Amino acid sequence: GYSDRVQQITLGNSTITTQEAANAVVCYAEWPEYLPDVDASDVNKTSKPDTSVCRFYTLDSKTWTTGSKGWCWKLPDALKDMGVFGQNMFFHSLGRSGYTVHVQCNATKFHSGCLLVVVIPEHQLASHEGGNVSVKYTFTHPGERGIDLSSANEVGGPVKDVLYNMNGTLLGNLLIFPHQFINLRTNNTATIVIPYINSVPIDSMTRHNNVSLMVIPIAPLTVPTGATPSLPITVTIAPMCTEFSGIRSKSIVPQ
Amino acid sequence: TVASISSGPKHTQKVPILTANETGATMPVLPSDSIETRTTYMHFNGSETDVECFLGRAACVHVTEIQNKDATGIDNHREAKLFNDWKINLSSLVQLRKKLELFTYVRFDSEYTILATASQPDSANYSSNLVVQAMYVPPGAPNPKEWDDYTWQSASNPSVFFKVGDTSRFSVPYVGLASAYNCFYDGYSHDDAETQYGITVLNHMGSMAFRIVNEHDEHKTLVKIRVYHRAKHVEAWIPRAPRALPYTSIGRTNYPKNTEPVIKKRKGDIKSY
Amino acid sequence: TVASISSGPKHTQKVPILTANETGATMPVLPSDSIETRTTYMHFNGSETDVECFLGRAACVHVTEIQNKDATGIDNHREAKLFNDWKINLSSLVQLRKKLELFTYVRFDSEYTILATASQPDSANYSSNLVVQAMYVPPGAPNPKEWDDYTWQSASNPSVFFKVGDTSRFSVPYVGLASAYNCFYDGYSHDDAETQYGITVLNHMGSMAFRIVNEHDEHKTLVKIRVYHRAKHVEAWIPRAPRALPYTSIGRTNYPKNTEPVIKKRKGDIKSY
Amino acid sequence: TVASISSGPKHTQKVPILTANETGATMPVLPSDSIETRTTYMHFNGSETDVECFLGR
Amino acid sequence: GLPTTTLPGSGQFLTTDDRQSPSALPNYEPTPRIHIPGKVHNLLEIIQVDTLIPMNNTHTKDEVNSYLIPLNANRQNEQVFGTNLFIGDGVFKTTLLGEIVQYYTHWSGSLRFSLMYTGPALSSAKLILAYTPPGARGPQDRREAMLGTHVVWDIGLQSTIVMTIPWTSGVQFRYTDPDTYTSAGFLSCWYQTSLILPPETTGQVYLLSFISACPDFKLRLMKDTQTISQTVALTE
Amino acid sequence: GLPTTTLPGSGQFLTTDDRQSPSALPNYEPTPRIHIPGKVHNLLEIIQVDTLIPMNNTH
Amino acid sequence: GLPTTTLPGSGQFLTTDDRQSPSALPNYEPTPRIHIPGKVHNLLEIIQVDTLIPMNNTH
Amino acid sequence: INYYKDAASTSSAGQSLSMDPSKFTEPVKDLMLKGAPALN
Amino acid sequence: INYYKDAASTSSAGQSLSMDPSKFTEPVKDLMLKGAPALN
Amino acid sequence: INYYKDAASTSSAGQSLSMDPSKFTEPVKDLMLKGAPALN
Ligand SMILES: Cc1cc(CCCCCCCOc2ccc(C3=N[C@@H](C)CO3)cc2)on1
């Protein structure tokens, strides 16, 4: 009586149940694991807070309306302030982590709409100015708020044009990245497990984000007659196999 | 190898063509799941689509130019093209760039070919024979100030001398600092409020300096350098969506404003053929 | 091997020389069936009549020309021969064409040799040294518009750079879409009422583009390109009647009107020697 | 080859980090004598610092 | 001294040749490789992942909406969409498949075309997808369409339908770039019965459509893509 | 570096010589051969089929 | 005479390449080596000897 | 025959002949069998 | 010795030494023996 | 393969792979053990 459909994920002191899942994706078919010695470089023993950092943090909720263009969060940024995960983050020189991402959106059998939930490794954004204008730090570190693709261009911020993925590629091809759809008629959640993907064994958690999670409405939300025209979307994310190394004074970052 | 097996009528409870794309999978459906097929063999291996093959041919990565002329009274050799210099990079020209950016991280050895041809746009009695000297000036090492500085001694820095009209060829191991080169980097060099974003900060490869060894003749001679790059021993990770809009800058993803629609509009209906 | 066996007088009921040609056969009759012969050996193998040998020597297949000159103010490089281009084909010149069309389908690898020589028809101080760059522009890939377009980067398209006066040589596998190249094709590309007839539609091989890499000197230089083609690994099917009338077009069988009698008229009688 | 071995807390009478430089020696002290380390390998031979290489171009 | 003769081609530079060269950095030791998920070995590996087709190409500036094929409730017998199968051009051209095919001159193989339905769960519909092999015109009505490769799709719990365009061809390779002789057919879709919405519901519903290549597929003779060009070298 | 000497004829192009060359299309896979009746191997095979002689050349 | 083809790079001088050359002094006999204390093999050997740092740079 | 000492100086590599699209085409956590229902 | 990797790059092929004119000179359905009458 | 007769004409030497810093880092007459007191 197991269905692909019902699932339970327990991680730390927190549990999620979905009764309307559509399997789960594990990026590149690899599950998060700690850093092996053969791959290690820094000689420091690392710190593995385990259950105090590897639990589920639910970010603040978004509201899908007929005019929504899509939202974008960066990792580990989105979690920069969650509990002890965040403290560890500002206090060590280097850290490394994988995540379980669970995006939630329920409706009824009269609604229609379909969101794309995708994880993009190394999502370098484009400046809407063109040329070689850079995208300032603050703009690519929105924190739990994430970036709202239907917000206005700002100065020093990225471009927010959806048919171009914020980088000069077409929305249609985002499907080459680990992703899952939430089609109100099928699905009510999306779950993706992200292994740590980098060109170095461990890195800085503040100067470099290693994935952007993106939720994009593709088939517009259509509510039943005289229904309220909107649904909330909630994102809950859990660091998994986290390791921190090179402890010290506590980083100070712009803004 | 069979490309298609033989398959006949079906009346089952087992439907391989109905799936749920919401899952993120592309189910491996074949012609024989939905029509009646006959056996056929592949006769093919997919040899020429190997990434080593795809990135393994020489591509032009840079065209520069230097001239041989009397430096007498020149206050700025660099500025007179008495010796140009190139900030090594692999995204200045776009044919090869779009190919590499199909991947996120890439690792390979490089084979460089350098072709140098001379031009004599204004009245010369003859064509002189010039020897070019291209130096590798990695970051931290004195960079040439005049076309005949102590720098050119290049006692510790690899340099090649070849003749204009000829070609020079040598191969450099993968010089990246990390395990792969980042084709993309969503980071900064530090948490500064105004530091540049992108890979410009990561792809710190240093520059390469060219000059003519010959002193000047009576006429002036323009030498134009073309650098070709071939990846050998390629390794590529994490495929990405291909580049759709035009490029504007080395190292940023930025596209131009008021660009044009990249998807061709139908001449007719959705229903049109 | 015997070329003739010894044979003596015959008075038989078994006549090998009477046959019925209406059957379509050529009965294998020999000297020894009708005269008295002596033994003789062949001393020969027929080596130099092998089709690999017959089609295996280089033949000139194309002569084109490009010039190096100041492109300043040229509105149409292609038109100034600032870079010509050739619609690859193998019937433009006829010596090799008649040889190939002795067969209906032919399959082979090609070895190309390209000789480039320069001419300076009007007053020059000297002969410059130019490097040619020939690109393979298969169908579907951007074709060059100026003599120094992004196209020439040729990041994915094989190109060779050699010096004028020298020769370039490389070999291309059999690139046909079918199992053999059609020397003839009695069809159309589709059942259209006005589409072209012939092979022109089948022998879609794309074109090859040449240019000089050098910028301009003070004089002008004419470079004339000759492409030679040698078949290697030849396979030929279905022999046909040799070409009798002159050719008029690449890819059609058409002969010229009011052509001349191709059979030599006797100077004398049927009875004449 | 290991570049660093794994080493944990220490509370000894055996102090490798106190020396007397007046002796003229450079005592071979390592990260693992004064912090807690994890194993890591060298992955490197020191090929390009050989004097033949240094004076050989 | 051993006697030699040099052949035609000496000194040429062929961008596609593969030979040895002296290393400029003798004895240098590259950084160790660490493990990174996601390694690609063949472009054939990636063109089997499906991506969305902007089938609804009828707009005037690129929009998220050209990915949506609309469906109308209560229409009978009628046609949902049509397209030829020049995978190197037109709708296909910007898709990952289209985009890679363009790096090669010839392709052969089967294509997988699937449609995922996004209408309310309490609605229902039956569509017919038809592949018309080269030689006939794009079908003009379902009767015409239904006589060639087709699948009646019944919209249900299982949200997507995967249609395969089996390789139907005389010649074993076709050009990517639009060739006539080499052309592959048409793909059309019609109401089999009709879309029906539940009460309290209204308007258009959309289908998303994807394209990917079957394991069948072959691509050969690499060349340059018409999809990217430039007028001056970029700088930093 | 192995010592060599080049002989007379170096650099010449003889249309009849038979040597190896680099392939411009590294790794390309040609179309499979299918069977076709009629293969010719030697011109000696075909000159044994008889054909008509315009003997009456007098026109 | 063995057929050859020369590749791109022929005739170049790369200061970092390592090949054989004819000896200008054929048959000459170098002075014997005697023992000398102190041989260095790697620069890695010497950067492990400590030296003083002008830390007080303020002059 | 390598004429040179360093590995970077050798010619192009030789075909992976690796090929495994499943990391890209089927990265699902619970295995999907073709023919069995997608969602149970 | 092939110096190159691809088959197209090898020299000319070597003599068929196949040679069988009968597909062209005697494509008759019922075998004709020289010496026996052509038409029986 | 050496093509030449004299030893000077051969290419560069090959890595010492000798490496022993103790003549430079620990030339002390009585051996010092790390961890034991420097001056007893
Ligand atoms: C004489 C002489 C001259 C030289 C040059 C040595 C080569 C050094 C260059 C190293 C390779 O440089 C790069 C730069 C960028 C990238 C790259 N950028 C991303 C888009 C992808 O790859 C890769 C290699 O060596 N000897």
Ligand SMILES: Cc1cc(CCCCCCCOc2ccc(C3=N[C@@H](C)CO3)cc2)on1
């Ligand atoms: C640089 C560079 C330049 C090139 C050219 C590649 C060769 C492509 C040409 C392929 C062979 O072309 C043909 C064309 C026609 C025929 C043919 N036509 C009939 C009469 C018979 O054969 C055969 C081969 O490759 N690299």
